[PDB]
């Protein structure tokens, strides 16, 4: 029911700093969020570093 959007036409190459100015604050996470992330990610990498692998290994 809403309108079909106009043809896509966002600016091609805007300034990185202006984008970083919005992305940096918004990426903030509480200590318990970061702690879960840290643990999950550490476990995944430990598993990665444990087969016969990939192109990268070759």
């Amino acid at each position: 029911m809403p309108n079909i959007p106009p043809p896509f036409t966002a600016p091609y190459a805007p300034d990185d700093a202006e984008i970083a100015a919005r992305l940096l604050p918004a990426s903030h996470l509480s200590p318990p969020q970061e702690a879960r992330i840290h643990r999950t990610a550490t476990r995944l990498i430990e598993a990665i570093r444990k087969r016969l692998g990939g192109v990268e290994d070759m």
Binding site: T42, I45, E46, A47, R49, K50
Partner: protein, 57 residues
């Protein structure tokens, strides 16, 4: 003993675990075991080493 979780990784092994992860350290330890078992003739006493390194050959 009983190992409590969340232990700060210290020592040569702890620092190794923080760097490579516990699974790689286990894998590195098993390789060290093949090296120690194949390339050294060892015992608590010389009699045990010598018995171990025996081959009428």
């Amino acid at each position: 003993r009983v190992i409590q979780p969340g232990e700060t990784p210290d020592g040569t092994i702890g620092r190794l675990v923080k760097r490579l992860g516990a699974p790689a350290v286990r894998t590195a330890t098993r390789q060290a075991m093949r090296l120690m078992g194949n390339h050294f003739v060892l015992g608590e006493t010389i009699e045990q080493a010598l018995e171990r390194g025996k081959p009428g050959q």
